[PDB]
Amino acid sequence: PQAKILSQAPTELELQVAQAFVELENSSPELKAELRPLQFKSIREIDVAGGKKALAIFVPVPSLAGFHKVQTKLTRELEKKFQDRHVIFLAERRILPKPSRTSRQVQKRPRSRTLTAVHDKILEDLVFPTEIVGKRVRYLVGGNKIQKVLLDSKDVQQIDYKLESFQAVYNKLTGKQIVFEIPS
RNA sequence: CGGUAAUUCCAGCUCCAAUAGCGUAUAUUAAAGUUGUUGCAGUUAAAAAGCUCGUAGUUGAACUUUGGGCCCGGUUGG
Fold first, then answer.
1. How far is the CA of A98 from the C1' of B49 (A)?
2. Could you tell me at which residue positions the Glycyl lysine isopeptide (Lys-Gly) (interchain with G-Cter in ubiquitin) crosslink is annotated in this chain?
3. Which residues have a Cβ under 8 Å from the Cβ of A66 and sit 6 or more positions away?
4. B strand bases under 7 Å from protein CB
5. Which of A10, A55, A115, A133 has the smallest number of Cβ neighbours within 10 A?
């Protein structure tokens, strides 16, 4: 089972979570149907303030639309089984380097593989249930940048307590500071 | 400027400027932001074409690897 729900089974933490999938799939006749085709590729643990950790789960991008039907419940369940964790799902995306004037030619680089485009999609996935309603960028006199992301005040209670963990996760993946705000 | 009564003509004194050199004519440069790339002007002083379309010419919005770590590291100053 486990090596057939992982796209590879190299390490034990994925085996723990893989088991939880198999367990939960039995506990309800509903999940027995929905969860069966899903798979995930890798997991990374990122430490954050207050001693907690983020379970960043990486998913094949053509299947991402499936998880969005089951991402609720799954977060409820997994945060019980792995006590003191925050769980978030991310699609894996390529990024291709920018061509130099010296390089030999290759097929034209699709715009979705640019670095700017990929980082925007990452941020969209973190806050998944809510929509982003705007962005700001601040250029401080010290010579450094901060982004502010504004969230739709809808169902925010599902993520309202996680925001500090999102800041830490995003920094690890990119090196960029962000803060979250919720317009009334 | 000069028609008597001359600070301007003519002469005599005195004085000034450059000086082995000084003056005149013609051309050209600066002065000239009176040819304007730097850098002009066009209500009333010279100068916006009766009006619109349109080829050559001149000109044309934004976007694609950014940021963060670790070594070596030359020059100058204390």
1. 54
2. 80-81, 121
3. A37, A38
4. 63-68
5. A10
